[PDB]
Structure formats: structure tokens, C-alpha cells
Design a protein around this ligand. Structure first.
Ligand SMILES: *Cc1c(COP(=O)(O)O)cnc(C)c1O
Ligand SMILES: *Cc1c(COP(=O)(O)O)cnc(C)c1O
Ligand code: NA
Ligand code: NA
Ligand code: NA
Ligand code: NA
Lengths: 382, 390
């Protein structure tokens, strides 16, 4: 009750559920994976995972093995039949703990194939392995040609020894948020080639999957067996080029709000905040919003971030500080403690995360994900 | 336990922020030398600017800091509650208050609390009345920053008057008068003198009316480093304590006898050969110019690697500086290794003090169009801190 007075990030789990339902409707031939990496994109890993699973997600996706292990360890437990996949591995990571926790683990390289095979051997339980194909993104993923040939061969031998099963073949798009970008078709072609190859050699995955949010929303031919619509599950559109949340029956899950710390009159010609990059044009009132870049308010939104205060959109006045920023209230005199709504779903006349993204020269994914740990999350409709 | 040690040893494999507390102690000594007339406050807000509030507070107190500074009352209360405790005689100040906050709990914990406004004067006086123990109040003057303090003139007249009435009722003592600079990182900016002149005037007024503060203070890091006339009784050199210079205009850390406290490093997750004409990362903003090797660094913007440093952020890998290739993702980014074939798991050093040929937080600030304060402070909770020289 006390930390929330300054500020809070309200997480509407009924919105999250509604988004999962909308995404399931949009991808009727596929299972839906709830991507809950990075503390569920800043929304809270476990509560969001629970909600998504209640709304019909049958897979959970995380980056690190620690994130996936925390899901498995949650109490009360998520259903034991939910598949949990993690993909960001480094040498010497906790492969054995993952295998014992029945996680689907991604493998993009021989080193990881060797480590997971060794861990399955030492645990006496077979691993569930997803082979990642680099189809054109040039990040994670095994390259086509000899690398893929070798990896597929090593996977087959490990299957032959009862040490694992390849449960999936997957990849990830570079440019799916730009509809008609040529790389999209090129990646889908290479994905079909590489998965056809793996299956010809003998692998029998349960799932094949490539689609992130923008592909889920715009490319039914990319749905395959499983879709991974991360940002959309949080009700945020991947890009204005793809559309608005409303275009897809989505509703932003996070509302970020604060309580004014100070409301004061100042003369004209008064500088505001570091460097004095704003100067009051005449006698006015200033409002102090007690969130700053340590809380995830991006310093790049200096002079531009929008905030609903006392019935009107205000903008940041000058530089955002570590813990606070100022707005010029133009003579209005809300009371101290009055609500300042930085972003939300938008139906109360407040800004959206996408407005902040534009103000900060970034994408809405970065805005929601990097809301700081100093801001308490308040869960509604759990 | 062995199960807890293996868990810790496990998260550090991907990445870590190494926090050298001997560097922090050295910085505190350097800053105390620089401000010989004043007590030093260790500003440990925002989880010690991303370094860890309690360990950094302890190290700063060991090195001679006699005040700790935090933004929120919750941060200040957490310092008081630390076990083993910090010395009971260290003063802890907090300044970022909102209506209905825990004034009574702060008064009972003997915190110095900042007040900029009549609402807060009323709330803290009420809390002191309910607790039956006097509050320690610092009045903040708005001397020109236009953020948190009380405006000169009638507002300050009213606030000083209210404080005097509260003192007369035994409900508080005004233990400080303070302010904060707008432009101290820009030496010779005319606002600096303007603020100091206003500060002197407002504090003189308060004392003329009867207030007797223990400390007057206005100096942040760049004022501490450059403006001895601003030291007054107490200095608050936040970023410098962490070894980071407030701006290249002020100077380098080495110019002030400072050393960066944080080193951010990761272990490569993948090293692979790719052909020429291969796009790299979202939007394909980088395309390989010929056959090359790519290295995957398993940190991304969820870990505090700013997305603005896409195509520019520097990283030491396998003996050379590399730059981010294309877009930084949520959890990873790629570098073009130009054919080099380090081992998976090899160390990628993003920033540190710079003596091992690695970049500094200032290099990332420039890459990302920001200030080094933002770089260190926003390193994500998903990156474990490893404390050395406790
Ligand atoms: C982060 C992530 C996703 C989800 O991406 P969105 O754009 O948020 O839908 C899908 N797959 C992988 C591998 C990811 O890393
Ligand atoms: C953050 C802060 C400081 C320290 O600022 P630096 O530039 O890091 O030294 C000093 N005082 C106050 C009130 C602050 O909020
Ligand atoms: Na790919
Ligand atoms: Na501001
Ligand atoms: Na300090
Ligand atoms: Na000021």
C-alpha cells in the first residue's frame, strides 16, 4: 500500500487473457506459446504465465534457463503438462537441472548438443531438444549447409542412444514487422528447406515454429504448429506499420501511473531541470512526477514524453532526472498526490506505450520491458 | 549452502556486473580530499546507481562518508533495516515524498526528511505529533533548478514560518537547508553562480528568522569536483563515487583520481561462420560484407543494453574492440568478429574502468546518445552483481 503511493505499474491480467484468446482465434491451426522472458516483458513472469495458461496457452517461452526453472518451481504449480522452453544458453549452463525439470531446451550449435547429451546421460532422463535454424536473422540458430547437416546427424545419433528427442525445429524472423519485406519470404523458404531436410534424415519434431507477434498477426502461412506472439500478448502492437492494438482485438496490459509530488507556481524565465533545456515562457505552474530513468522513464523522452495530468495531456519539461521529471501545467493547480497517468490502454484519454516509444525514439517493447524494479507491480483480475 | 552457491555460480555464467568496492572506497577518499571543508554524503539512491545500495553504503561509510542519501523513504528505511546494521550514528536522508507516505515510520527511524512544500510540512508535523518524537527536517530551496524545492519569496517565507512554529511546539528541528544545481556539469554556466547567490540569500533569510541547521548543502558531483565555494557543510557526489565522470566537459575519471566501480561482462553464446550478404538482426540494418564470423553476446535491452546503441555499442572480445552489428534485441546482440574464432563462452567485456583495454560506461553513453549515469543505473536486475573487495 505504501510503495504504490509514489507510482505503480498496474497489470490487468483479464486484458492479458483477452489478448491470448484473440491471438488463439487469429492462429487457429497452432498452439500458442506465452513468451514470458524478461519478467514477462516487465509485467511479472509467474502471474502472466498463470493467466496465459488459463486462457489457453499450452507452451511457455523464456530466454534463460533460470527464467524457465523459476516457472517450474512456482507454487502453486503451473499445470505439469505445460511445456516450457528456454533458448539462451552458454557453455556450462544448468543443462542437467533443465533436463530433470523436463524443459524444452534450444540447441543451435554442436557445443550445446554435446553438453545437453552429456547432461541427459548423467541424469538418466532423455532431453527435449529444439533445434534452432538460422534462416536469415543472423542471431541465434544453426546455419544451413554443413553446420545443419552435422547438427541434425548428431541429434539422430543421440536419439538412437535414447538420450533425447528432438521435440521441435524453429527459427525467428528479422523483418516480420515490415509487411512484404523480401526477407520474410526468403526466411520462410529457408525454414521449409531446413525442416524438410531434418525430417528426411529422420527427425520427427512435435512442433515447427517461426512466428513472433507480427508474423502471427499478418502471416497465416507462418503459423505452422506453434505461434510465439510475445508483445501482442501484452496488448502492444509490434509496430504502427502492423497496426494498433484495436486492429487485432488487443488491449495493453500495463498502466504506468504516479502521484504528483509537488505543484508550484513559478515566474516566467525560470529554467527547468538539468541544462535548463526548458524555460517557462511566463508565470505558470509546474508539476513534479516522481518517476525517472532509474524507474525506466527513458531519458530520450526528455522534452517529449506524454502524461495525462488533471484532465489534459502534458509533456515532459526539459531533462528527465534519475528519479523524477517535471511537467508545465500552464497554470492548472491540481493537488499534490493527484494522478499522473504515463501510459495505459488509452480508453481513459491517457497515452499508450507506443506514444512513449515515439517520444523516446524506440519501440514499445523497450518501454514496457524496462520499467524498473523500483516501480511496484499491482496485479488486477488475477 | 552448496545448493545456493551453485545457483549463484550458475547465473553469472551468462553475464555479470562486477562491483569493485575497493574502487568505490578509493573514490570516496578522493572526493573527501577534494572537499576538505565538508562532510561527504554517499548518494545510494536507485540501488546505488545500479551497483547495490547496501554494499555500496557500507563501503562508503568505511571510507569516511558520514551521510547516506536516498530518493524514496523505502530506500532509506531499507538502509536502516540492513543487517548487520550500518552504524547507528550515520545520518540517512531521503527526499522523494508524496502525500500519504510513511512519514511516521521515517520519523521513528530518525531519518532526515526533505520538505519542499506546505503539504509535506503539515504531514510530517502530524506524524511527529502522533509518534511523540521530533522529526529531522531538511528544507529544500528551489534556487533555480525548477524541480523539487520551495520557491523563493512568499512560499519560502511561509515554509520557514511553519517550520519555526513546529520547532516552537517541539515537533521537529530543521536540521538542513539544501538545494541542487541545474548546470554544474557545464563549468562557468551563469546559472551556477545565480543558484549559489539565491541559495545564500534563502539560507540567510531562514537563519535570520531563527532556523539553525546542522548542514547547508548544494553540491552534486560536478560541483564537488569543480566548485569549492559550493561545498558548504556537506557534499553529495553521487556519480563520482561510482567512479564515473559527470561529463567529458568536467573531465575523465583519471583527472579526479576516480576509478569506475562497475564492470559489465558476458560470455559468448555462439560463434558461427556466415557468408557475405547475410543480414544481421531485426530490420537487417547490418549486412555482412563478405564471409565472416558472428559472435552472440547474451545481453539485450531487458538487461539494460540500450537499444539506442544499435550499430554502435563497443565491446571487447578476443583482444579487439567490436561494435554491435545492427539492432540490439531484448536478450542478445551480435558482433561481427571479422573471421576470428574465439571459443563459445569467451569473455565479452562491455565496459569497465578501461585499464584492460575495454570500453567505459562513457563510451556506451556516447554510443547510445545519453549520459553515463543512465548506462550504469539501468543495468537490469537480470544481470547478477558480483561484489569484490568487500
Ligand atoms: C522475444 C521472442 C519472441 C516473441 O517476439 P515478439 O516480437 O514479442 O512476438 C518469439 N521468439 C523468440 C525466439 C524470442 O526471442
Ligand atoms: C541524485 C542526486 C545527487 C547526486 O547527483 P550526482 O550528479 O550523481 O552527484 C545529489 N543530490 C540529490 C538531491 C540527488 O537527487
Ligand atoms: Na533466423
Ligand atoms: Na523534467
Ligand atoms: Na555520493
Ligand atoms: Na534548485
Amino acid at each position: 500500500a505504501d510503495a504504490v503511493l509514489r507510482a505503480r505499474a498496474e497489470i490487468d491480467l483479464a486484458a492479458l487473457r483477452a489478448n491470448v484468446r484473440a491471438l488463439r482465434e487469429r492462429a487457429p491451426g497452432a498452439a500458442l506459446m506465452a513468451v514470458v522472458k524478461a519478467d514477462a516483458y516487465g509485467h511479472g513472469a509467474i502471474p502472466c504465465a498463470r493467466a496465459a495458461v488459463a486462457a489457453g496457452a499450452t507452451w511457455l517461452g523464456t530466454a534463460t534457463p533460470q527464467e524457465a526453472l523459476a516457472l517450474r518451481a512456482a507454487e502453486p504449480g503451473l499445470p505439469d503438462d505445460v511445456r516450457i522452453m528456454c533458448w539462451l544458453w552458454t557453455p556450462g549452463g544448468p543443462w542437467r537441472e533443465a533436463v530433470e525439470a523436463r524443459l524444452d531446451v534450444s540447441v543451435s550449435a554442436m557445443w550445446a548438443m554435446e553438453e545437453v547429451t552429456g547432461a541427459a546421460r548423467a541424469a538418466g532422463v532423455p532431453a527435449r531438444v529444439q533445434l534452432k535454424a538460422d534462416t536469415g536473422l543472423g542471431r541465434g540458430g544453426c546455419q544451413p549447409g554443413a553446420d545443419w547437416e552435422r547438427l541434425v546427424g548428431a541429434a539422430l545419433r543421440a536419439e538412437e542412444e535414447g538420450l533425447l528427442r528432438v521435440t521441435g525445429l524453429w527459427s525467428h524472423f528479422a523483418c516480420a514487422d515490415e509487411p512484404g519485406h523480401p526477407s520474410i519470404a526468403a526466411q520462410l523458404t529457408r525454414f521449409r528447406e531446413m525442416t524438410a531436410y531434418a525430417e528426411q534424415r529422420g527427425l520427427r519434431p512435435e512442433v515447427r515454429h517461426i512466428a513472433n507477434s507480427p508474423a502471427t498477426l499478418t502471416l497465416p502461412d507462418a503459423h505452422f504448429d506453434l505461434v510465439r506472439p510475445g508483445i501482442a500478448m501484452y496488448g502492444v502492437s509490434p509496430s504502427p506499420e502492423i497496426g494498433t492494438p484495436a486492429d487485432f482485438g488487443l488491449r495493453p496490459v500495463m498502466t504506468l501511473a504516479a502521484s504528483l509530488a509537488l505543484v508550484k507556481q513559478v515566474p516566467g524565465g525560470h529554467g527547468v531541470s538539468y541544462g535548463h533545456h526548458y524555460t517557462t515562457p511566463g508565470e505558470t505552474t509546474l508539476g513534479l512526477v516522481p518517476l525517472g530513468y532509474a524507474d525506466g522513464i527513458p531519458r530520450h523522452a526528455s522534452s517529449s514524453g506524454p502524461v495525462l495530468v488533471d484532465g489534459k495531456w502534458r509533456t515532459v519539461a526539459g531533462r528527465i532526472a534519475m528519479d523524477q521529471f517535471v511537467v508545465d501545467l500552464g497554470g492548472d493547480r491540481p493537488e499534490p498526490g493527484a494522478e499522473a497517468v504515463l501510459f495505459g490502454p488509452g480508453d481513459r484519454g491517457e497515452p499508450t506505450a507506443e506514444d512513449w516509444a515515439q517520444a523516446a525514439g524506440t519501440i514499445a517493447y523497450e518501454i514496457v520491458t524496462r520499467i524498473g524494479s523500483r516501480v511496484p507491480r499491482v496485479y488486477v483480475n488475477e
